Enzyme design. Structure first.
Site, PDB file in Angstrom:
ATOM      1  N   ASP I 205      17.338  61.432  53.266  1.00 49.60           N
ATOM      2  CA  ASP I 205      17.834  61.551  52.184  1.00 49.60           C
ATOM      3  C   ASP I 205      17.620  59.761  51.333  1.00 49.60           C
ATOM      4  OD1 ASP I 205      18.621  63.895  52.338  1.00 49.60           O
ATOM      5  OD2 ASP I 205      20.571  63.431  53.148  1.00 49.60           O
ATOM      6  N   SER I 206      17.013  59.035  51.861  1.00 52.55           N
ATOM      7  CA  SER I 206      16.614  57.783  51.107  1.00 52.55           C
ATOM      8  C   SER I 206      15.396  58.061  50.449  1.00 52.55           C
ATOM      9  CB  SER I 206      16.437  56.746  52.452  1.00 52.55           C
ATOM     10  OG  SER I 206      16.545  55.512  51.719  1.00 52.55           O
TER      11      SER I 206
END
Ligand SMILES: [Mg+2]
Ligand SMILES: [Zn+2]
Ligand SMILES: [Zn+2]
Ligand SMILES: [Zn+2]
Lengths: 257, 192, 35, 98, 64, 48, 240, 44, 477, 40, 49, 115
Positions: I205-206
């Site tokens: 989720d970066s």
């Protein structure tokens, strides 16, 4: 064991872009050339702004940010201009920076468009590219914007405002002979503009012996430098980086022995 | 480090092309759902005409729901398998599922074939209205659509009733997640 | 005469636009207070 | 004079009622601002709608835990008067008692 | 609030095209035709004007 | 358990209190193991 | 009353003895860093320049600690305080004068946190031993904590806004304790299920599946690039 | 010490002790004038 | 029913319910009943005719509005109790048309199914293609996005306020967004998003951002903090006034520089400030006079934007000071799309380092492919594909949820006509080496939001801080 | 059939209670009834 | 007391068209804090005379 | 607050060496060249030139960390040839290639500009 013998074929040369093909070169050299276009070609941009008055609806560093992004004509002056860090002056002088001034006051009932045409430089060689003009801020009656700015030398690796390219299309192996990209369904992919395949064909036959060569460039310029001057500046700048590296390497070798 | 820098060459992605299926696959999925709906209709007609014999240990209603829920579960499985077999070696949904990095076989089926039956408290969508799940159905409608069987995939999009029943079923997960967070570490600190 | 299916999508959003032109989005707060 | 009523913005009794968008801008008000809130000591305060059971309606519920098999309650309230609400339960005692 | 000077993606100049774009639209040009007339070929630069919301115009309706 | 034709060995209960008052504490220790194992192993998880 | 002070979850016994705020603790957002070791945490320079470790002055480190004192708070890495044998604390930034800053054995210099410093890195809720593991500090130039993607699983940490706590052991005794008991590599296998607690994860796990396929062939140039990232490589290129 | 009226936009010099109000407007919302000190911005 | 539809004795909001089985007619006229407008159906035909639409089309200069629809008896409000007795049609063109007679007694018809959504759920494009929880996550994220919260934000002096430099309206939009004025006050920017695993810095989720895009004002925002201080004369013994303290005048003053303050004890607009600086100089007379000036938090560092001095409701002089801090996106700042795809910025690469298309287009944001499969937010992929068609076609795309005239195949066919792969994939070249990436990357315009959560507001460190006196334990100072 | 599982079942064990939520037995048959459904 | 007897966090069928099914906070308030659908209206009441 | 100045990427701070050579003891005739304030632009171009030398057994570069501005170039040559000698020849061959490209691009511009 030695250098390549690259050849250049310019396909298009206008005021906004230069399209050319480089053959007999390594992919690493071809790519490092396009990275230098973006990040290592020096131009002149505003990097120091003082706002005496700003009654506009945009705050001071909003205005200052837009000023830095206005391209300034830096074709030949950039070469003879010095880096502020390298210059020995008292943080600014004609040898390392260009002074700019903006003083616009709105007194009419109509909205006043503060454009780059209102940026006035002490050096005629360094002026905004557009002088439609780049909009800086719209002023209402009674609002004014009075500031002075200094434009200094830099390249796109420090800030994108010193990037002289509006787009750098780079390509090689348009027909995919080398299979550097594998299509799940080659028939689904549009032909490249440099493709030399028939309509029925979708991919060139695989070339196990092939190597990346004949790289296609299209260097679009923002306006600070002519599209051909970007490439010439990039090739000399990249060569300067390597020649500078070798000088330091020679010293390190001498110390070791 | 080694495989992060090879991935700079290989590259990995996920897109619309990974969610599509062959026109042959779509027809097979559509055929399975059409037959599954007819099977449920046949089961309903048996119950309506009192031709349904209750199974041991369960009442007539539980026998009917069990029979319906198995038909729809089979349709979800049969359609889900049909979608997976259509995936090519190049599909990026399959690549992440096969490696175990992210996703599962069920996610592929929902994205490609059918989202399936929505359940609230382990049962089909309840008759929140008077004998109706929503005002858009007739009273006493035990068909797959009425009770919350989403026949569309996420690629195809849910119909307004499917969208609402999916939110009802998806609200249960949110409540359960909050419940677990409240209970997080409660047993641990009692044991300790 | 009648809204045909090819004209329904345009029609349904003209009705919705008229609703929000007349009511707005906080008509509940305002109407309750005005009462 | 008996007091001051706080006024919901853009209500019929607000100063920004019926004003055209230019009139709102002259007052440094956003035409897109919907109103519907109060300014109390300079803070825009919004009253959240509170959800409560309907009154005057007979509702029959069954509670397993309680001693009543069924209970029919009716929260009664007058017609725009006597804000207080009185609840009457008509419950059936559970058959558990032997 | 105001048109960005450069396209974010590529850095192409876009700050001198907003008024021209509005003028073309008033001339009955479709948004696609107007963007083509201004030389915005890459869909990143078309994104710049197609999605720009000119809030500065309404900000100027408030007396300073 | 006392019922005829009912396995008095394998027959068991999930109520630990019932097991304690019928079979003893050691049966509770074993039964508590089995109930605890069932909940942990229900979803295929493993605990030493 | 006195009874009210002791009672309650915020009472002295439960609110000030069982749990309490601690010095030398940092917290910020965590972001990925595939270039760090599993046992290595990237730390902002501002956090490093604020948290200090008191090093006892020794002839081994007399010159090294003397320099940090000279650099002081202004320049990082430096020092914040000097603790003499008397136990008295001298604030460096007040006075950079070398005359009063001479060090001798037994002094403690509260130097700034530097690379290789052992810290305890934690994510809440702390549900198992792997929720508080030891890391080596690695100063990096932005304002986030960095984690190798493998240690996300033991921490149950995602990079969607999660925050994690950093505790710096302040003595050699407690520092040696983390090194030998709570470091991430020592926590690879858990006793809960006698299986590894962290493995290969999203991008690497998908890529290794692709990388290990039968029809993956790497040319000479590609292989030489990969071996640059194999720290354990012995320098011999295998026969293709 | 220049204050600008929020209504009529009139610069007027006001001391610390004397009350805050427009000299001619009577408006009681006043804004301080921009500082004469020069602050540098990097156009970054 | 006839009287209510005629706006006769019965008003529009009065709900009549008949319980046919229970032999009860219940009429409700009180407040708090939630109702929605529905089109009336008679004999399997909408009472809404083309003549009503034509009058609505010329809404202005015609006096015809929504009320005439209610007056005409074509649309009526139905509360939840009355909805139980209503046979409702989702659409007119599919439900009450001559077909297999599932039901031939429809009494009402939905104006549009997408009206079941609220304000925040109405900005999600293709929310019917997303797994439902991710539509719930976006509704929460959409409230934390950045944009222009109100047009007259310069006049207002709020305690906190985030303004985006360059808000853009979505290329892919919903019909409901017109009435939310989202086009007027957008919260986000249309970004060229590549769903690829570029360097491993977008994992879990970066997000990988383009540094050069950030350099050009991409997602740059402004932070406004306002501080209010009033001087109170209450109590004859003690009194406090605005004035810059002087060393001799006040017995005790901190060594923090007071040069920023003016002679009136207030800092002037356009002055750089930091934690070491004092913005308001307030001194209270002792029973010399003690100083009670107001400082800034060390984290804050900005420029005084606006200082206004007035009288509060209590008639006391008080000043509101607005400090402005520009926030350039950096590692650790949260970004989210309109599909619950929330993530921090893992790293920022310059343009030369980003992967580029044959045209030289580099993504503004690169997200991990592993974010999609588990979440099943296909609407994100359909947005990116639709957004690509919109940007090339020059038309704002329509992502209204329950639209049978829009599907992925139609969007794919359009994308082919612009010289792009119909599924939105593109051949990207490695930025570092220039070599073609073996896999073709899914790249296109997607609307992203900058969430209020910046890392700078969250980073904080403690090292031998200001313990409490009573407890001798740490506390914020 | 359904029985308590997960956390609520786990809580009951540590929270030993005279009344479980879902008390039950598992009766095993040793005679012919074990292999004969009718006799079972 | 009312909330204890029947769970109000769950999305009820009757919320269709009245309350947004998607917009609900995540955490301890899931399902308890609701938002109106776009065309949903709350009646202001009138006299039954 | 921790943002590094943008010039940190290409400007050596005081006391920083542009290039440092460390002998690689793992293998004979192997050296590691740590070049500061450089990135893939010079690392990739230099590495590809080295691979053209038949006396270079191994050529590779890497950026140990994107947030840092060093490239490490590992060169392994044959016993009769030194990595330092190979490294110098690659730079000269690159300068010769770039010098040739500059000359030929100028000619191409004149041809296009002239007609
Ligand atoms: Mg998280
Ligand atoms: Zn100079
Ligand atoms: Zn562009
Ligand atoms: Zn005035």
């Amino acid at each position: 064991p030695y250098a390549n013998q690259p050849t250049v074929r310019i396909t298009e040369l206008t005021d906004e872009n230069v399209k050319f093909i480089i053959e007999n070169t390594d992919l690493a050299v071809a790519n490092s050339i396009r990275r230098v276009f973006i990040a290592e070609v020096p131009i002149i941009a505003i990097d120091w702004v003082q706002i005496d008055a700003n009654s506009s609806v945009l705050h001071d560093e909003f205005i200052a940010h837009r000023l830095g992004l206005i391209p300034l004509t830096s074709d030949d002056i950039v070469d003879k201009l010095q880096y502020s860090r390298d210059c020995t002056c008292e943080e600014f002088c004609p040898e390392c920076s260009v002074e700019f001034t903006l003083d616009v006051r709105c007194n009419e009932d109509q909205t006043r468009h503060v454009t780059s045409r209102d940026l006035i430089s002490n050096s005629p060689r360094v002026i905004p590219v557009t002088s439609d003009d780049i909009l800086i801020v719209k002023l209402r009656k009674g609002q004014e914007l009075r500031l002075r700015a200094y434009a200094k030398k830099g390249f796109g690796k420090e800030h994108a405002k010193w990037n002289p390219t509006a787009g750098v299309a780079f390509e090689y192996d348009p027909d995919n002979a080398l299979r550097h990209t594998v299509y799940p369904k080659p028939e689904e992919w549009p032909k490249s503009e440099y493709s030399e395949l028939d309509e029925d064909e979708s991919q060139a036959p695989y070339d196990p012996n092939g190597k990346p060569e004949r790289f296609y460039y299209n260097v679009e310029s923002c306006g600070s430098l002519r599209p051909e001057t970007i490439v010439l500046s990039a090739l000399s700048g990249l060569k300067k980086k390597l020649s500078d590296l070798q000088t330091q390497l020679s010293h390190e070798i001498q110390s070791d022995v | 480090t080694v495989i992060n820098n090879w991935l700079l060459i290989e590259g990995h992605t996920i897109g619309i092309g990974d969610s599509i299926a062959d026109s042959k696959t779509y027809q097979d999925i559509q055929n399975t759902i059409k037959k599954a709906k007819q099977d449920v209709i046949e089961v309903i007609e048996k119950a309506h005409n009192n031709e349904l014999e209750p199974t041991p240990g369960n009442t007539l209603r539980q026998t009917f729901e069990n029979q319906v829920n198995r038909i729809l579960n089979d349709a979800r499985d049969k359609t889900g398998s049909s979608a997976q077999k259509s995936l090519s070696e190049y599909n990026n949904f399959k690549s992440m599922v096969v490696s175990g990095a992210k996703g599962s076989k069920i996610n592929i089926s929902q994205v490609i074939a059918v989202v399936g039956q929505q359940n609230v408290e382990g049962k089909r969508i309840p008759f929140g209205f008077k004998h109706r799940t929503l005002p858009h159905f007739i009273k006493d409608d035990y068909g797959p659509e009425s009770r919350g069987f989403v026949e569309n995939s996420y690629l195809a999009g849910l119909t307004p009733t499917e969208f609402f029943f999916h939110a009802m079923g998806g609200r249960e997960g949110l409540i359960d997640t909050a419940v677990k967070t409240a209970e997080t570490g409660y047993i641990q600190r009692r044991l300790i | 005469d009648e809204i045909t299916p090819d004209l329904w999508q345009e029609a349904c959003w003209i009705v919705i636009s008229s609703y929000f032109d007349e009511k707005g989005l906080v008509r509940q707060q305002l109407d309750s207070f005005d009462e | 004079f008996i007091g001051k009523i706080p006024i919901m913005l853009r209500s019929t009794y607000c100063l920004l009622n019926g004003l055209t968008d230019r009139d709102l801008c002259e007052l440094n008000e956003c035409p897109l601002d919907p109103g519907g809130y109060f300014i109390i000591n300079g803070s825009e305060k919004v009253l959240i709608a509170q959800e409560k059971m309907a009154t005057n309606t007979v509702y029959v519920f069954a509670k397993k835990d309680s001693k009543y098999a069924y209970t029919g309650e009716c929260r009664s309230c007058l017609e725009n008067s006597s804000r207080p609400t009185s609840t009457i339960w008509v419950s059936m005692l559970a058959r558990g008692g032997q | 609030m105001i048109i960005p000077v450069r396209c974010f993606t590529c850095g192409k100049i876009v700050g001198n095209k907003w008024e021209a774009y509005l003028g073309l639209l008033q001339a009955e040009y479709t948004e696609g035709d107007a963007l083509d007339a201004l030389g915005l070929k890459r869909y990143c630069c078309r994104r710049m004007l197609l999605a720009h919301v000119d809030l500065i115009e309404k900000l100027l309706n408030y007396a300073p | 358990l006392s019922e005829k034709d009912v396995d008095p060995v394998r027959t068991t209960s999930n109520d630990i209190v019932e097991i304690f008052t019928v079979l003893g504490i050691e049966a509770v220790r074993k039964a508590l193991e089995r109930e605890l194992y069932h909940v942990i192993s229900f979803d295929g998880s493993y605990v030493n | 009353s006195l009874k009210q002070r002791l009672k309650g979850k915020e009472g002295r016994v439960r609110g000030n003895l069982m749990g309490k705020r601690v010095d030398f603790s940092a917290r910020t957002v965590i972001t990925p860093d595939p270039n760090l070791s599993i046992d290595q945490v990237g730390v902002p320079r501002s956090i490093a320049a604020n948290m200090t470790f008191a090093e006892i002055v020794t002839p081994f480190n007399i010159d090294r600690l003397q320099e940090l004192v000279r650099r002081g708070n202004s320049q990082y890495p430096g020092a914040k305080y000097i603790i003499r044998d008397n136990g008295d604390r001298i604030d460096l930034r007040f006075h950079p004068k070398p005359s009063d800053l001479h060090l001798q054995t037994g002094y403690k210099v509260e130097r700034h946190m530097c690379d290789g410093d052992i810290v305890i890195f934690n994510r809440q809720p702390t549900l198992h031993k792997m929720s508080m593991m030891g890391h080596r500090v690695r100063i990096l130039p932005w304002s986030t904590f960095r984690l190798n993607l493998s240690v996300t699983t033991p921490y149950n940490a995602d990079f969607d806004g999660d925050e994690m706590n950093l505790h710096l052991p302040q003595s050699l005794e407690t520092r040696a304790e983390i090194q030998e008991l709570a470091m991430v590599p020592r926590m690879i296998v858990t006793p809960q299920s006698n299986r590894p607690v962290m493995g290969i994860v999203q991008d690497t796990l998908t890529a290794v599946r692709k990388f290990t396929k039968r029809d993956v062939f790497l040319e000479r140039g590609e292989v030489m690039n990969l071996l640059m990232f194999l720290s354990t490589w012995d320098g011999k290129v295998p026969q293709p | 010490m220049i204050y600008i009226c929020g209504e009529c936009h009139t610069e007027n010099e006001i001391k610390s002790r004397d009350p805050i109000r427009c000299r001619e407007c009577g408006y009681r919302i006043m804004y301080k004038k921009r500082t004469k000190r020069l602050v540098v911005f990097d156009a970054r | 029913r006839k009287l209510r539809r005629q706006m006769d004795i019965i008003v529009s909001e009065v709900s009549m319910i008949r319980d046919i089985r229970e032999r009860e007619i219940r009429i409700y006229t009180d407040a708090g009943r939630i109702c929605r407008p529905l089109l009336i159906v008679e004999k399997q035909k909408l009472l809404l005719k083309k003549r009503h639409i034509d009058q609505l089309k010329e809404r202005e200069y015609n006096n015809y509005s929504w009320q005439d629809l209610v007056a005409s008896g074509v649309v009526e409000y139905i509360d939840t109790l009355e909805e139980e007795t209503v046979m409702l049609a989702m659409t007119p063109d599919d439900l009450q048309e001559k077909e297999v007679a599932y039901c031939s007694t429809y009494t009402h018809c939905e104006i549009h199914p997408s009206m079941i959504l609220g304000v925040c759920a109405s900005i999600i494009p293709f929310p019917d293609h997303n797994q439902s929880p991710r539509n719930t996550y976006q509704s929460a994220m959409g409230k934390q996005a950045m944009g222009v919260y109100i047009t007259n934000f310069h006049v207002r002096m709020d305690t906190l306020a985030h303004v985006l430099y360059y808000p853009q309206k979505p290329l892919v939009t919903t019909r409901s967004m017109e009435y939310l004025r989202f086009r007027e006050l957008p919260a986000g920017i249309n970004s060229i998003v590549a769903i690829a695993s570029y360097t491993g810095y977008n994992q879990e989720d970066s997000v990988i951002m383009n540094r050069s895009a950030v350099d050009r004002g991409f997602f740059r925002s402004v932070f406004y903090r306002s501080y209010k201080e009033q001087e109170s004369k209450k109590g004859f013994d003690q009194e406090e006034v605005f004035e810059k303290p002087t060393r001799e005048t006040c017995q005790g003053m901190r060594h923090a520089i007071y040069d920023k303050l003016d002679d009136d004890g207030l800092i002037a607009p356009g002055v750089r400030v930091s934690g070491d600086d004092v913005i308001i100089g307030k001194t209270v007379t002792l029973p010399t006079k003690r100083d009670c000036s107001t400082f800034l938090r060390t984290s804050e560092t900005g420029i005084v934007d606006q200082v206004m001095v007035t009288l509060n409701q209590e008639g006391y002089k008080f000043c509101k000071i607005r400090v402005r801090s520009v926030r350039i996106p950096q590692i650790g700042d949260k970004f989210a799309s309109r599909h619950g795809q929330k993530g921090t910025c893992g790293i920022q690469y310059r343009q030369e380092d980003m992967p580029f298309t044959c045209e030289g287009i580099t993504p503004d944001i690169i997200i991990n492919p592993h974010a999609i499969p588990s979440r099943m937010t296909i609407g994100h992929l359909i947005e990116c594909l639709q957004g690509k068609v919109s940007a090339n076609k020059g038309e704002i795309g329509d992502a209204t949820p329950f639209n049978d005239a829009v599907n992925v195949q139609k969007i794919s066919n359009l994308l082919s006509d612009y010289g792009y792969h119909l599924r939105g994939n593109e051949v990207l070249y490695n930025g570092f080496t220039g070599r073609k990436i073996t896999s073709q990357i899914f790249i296109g315009p997607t609307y992203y939001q900058r969430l209020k959560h910046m890392v700078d507001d969250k980073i904080h460190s403690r090292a031998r801080g200001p313990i409490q006196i009573l407890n001798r334990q740490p506390m914020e100072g | 059939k359904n029985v308590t599982l997960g956390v609520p079942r786990l809580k009951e064990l540590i929270n030993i209670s005279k009344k479980p939520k879902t008390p039950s037995l598992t009766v095993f048959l040793l005679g012919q009834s074990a292999r004969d459904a009718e006799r079972a | 007391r009312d909330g204890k007897l029947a769970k109000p966090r769950q999305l009820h069928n009757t919320l269709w068209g009245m309350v947004c099914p998607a917009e609900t906070p995540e955490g301890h308030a899931v399902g308890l804090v609701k938002n109106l659908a776009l065309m949903a209206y709350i009646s202001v009441g009138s006299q039954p005379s | 607050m921790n943002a590094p100045p943008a010039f940190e990427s290409f400007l050596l701070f005081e006391g920083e060496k542009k290039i440092t050579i460390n002998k690689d003891t793992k293998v004979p005739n192997a050296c590691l060249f740590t070049i500061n304030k450089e990135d893939h632009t010079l690392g990739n171009i230099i590495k590809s030139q080295l691979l053209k030398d038949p006396q270079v057994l191994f050529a590779g570069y890497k950026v140990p960390h994107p947030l840092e501005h060093k490239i490490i170039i590992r060169v392994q040559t044959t016993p009769d040839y030194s990595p330092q000698e190979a490294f110098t020849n690659a730079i000269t061959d690159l300068i010769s290639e770039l010098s040739l490209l500059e000359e030929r691009f100028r000619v191409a511009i004149k041809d296009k500009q002239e007609g």
